[PDB]
């Protein structure tokens, strides 16, 4: 046993972003987030 | 003190001060997916006496 023949390492998927309308206008601002939410599982994914 | 000469019989003094608007005001804590806020607003003023 000197071979050892091919396996697969790693995969990735790369998506997009969220589509928005160009002429509706942004309009952001910051704010604190609640330290008693689990926002792991809110953000995991490679989902828009 | 030394001595000076005028041509003149009254001598007047008039000191224009200035209190201008101190540069403090840090900057605002920011975001880069976001918007800005304004900056508030200042005062100078002036003075002026007579002696």
């Known amino acids: 046993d000197k071979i050892q023949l091919f396996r697969t390492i790693g995969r990735v998927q ?8 160009h002429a509706y206008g942004v309009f952001a601002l910051p704010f604190p987030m609640d330290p008693d939410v689990e926002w792991g599982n809110w953000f995991a994914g490679p989902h828009p | 003190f030394p001595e ?16 201008d608007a101190e540069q403090t005001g840090m900057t605002f804590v920011h975001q ?20």
Request: net charge neutral; no cysteine.
């Open chain 1, 14 to 21: 790369y998506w997009e972003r969220v589509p928005r309308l």
């Open chain 2, 4 to 19: 000076d000469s005028t041509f003149a019989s009254e001598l007047e003094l008039y000191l224009l001060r200035t209190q």
């Open chain 2, 32 to 51: 880069v997916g976001s918007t800005s806020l304004p900056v508030e607003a200042r005062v100078a003023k002036v003075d002026l006496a007579k002696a």
